[PDB]
């Protein structure tokens, strides 16, 4: 179905600005959820690697102005 990926944020960390992320990611067709964090400096995306990719959504964030890159997956631990 969908894969639960994490991305680490270099630029801004503020609720309303970050809120644009949600829409900028929800733009991806093959998306389910994108409950990004607006303090912890981490974006978290639930999307399928069929329709878009990390590179695409990364571009959406770069286009906002501030840089994005993958970290790994949901959380630092919880192997499941």
UniProtKB/Swiss-Prot annotation:
Cu(+) 2 binds at residues 14, 17. Belongs to the cation transport ATPase (P-type) (TC 3.A.3) family. Type IB subfamily. It is found in: Cell membrane. This is Copper-exporting P-type ATPase. Monomer at sub-stoichiometric copper concentrations. Homodimer at higher copper concentrations. Forms a heterodimer (electrostatic interactions) with CopZ during the transfer of Cu(+). The copZA operon is activated by CueR and indirectly repressed by YfmP. Induction: By Cu(2+). Involved in copper export. Residues 3-69 form the HMA domain. The chain holds residues 71 to 145 of 802 of the full protein.
């Amino acid at each position: 179905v969908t894969e639960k990926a994490e991305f680490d944020i270099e630029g801004m960390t503020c609720a309303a600005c970050a809120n644009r992320i949600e829409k900028r990611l929800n733009k991806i067709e093959g998306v389910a959820n994108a409950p990004v964090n607006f303090a912890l400096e981490t974006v978290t995306v639930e999307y399928n690697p069929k329709e878009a990719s990390v590179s695409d959504l990364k571009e959406a964030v770069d286009k906002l102005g501030y840089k994005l890159k993958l970290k790994g997956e949901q959380d630092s631990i919880e192997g499941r």
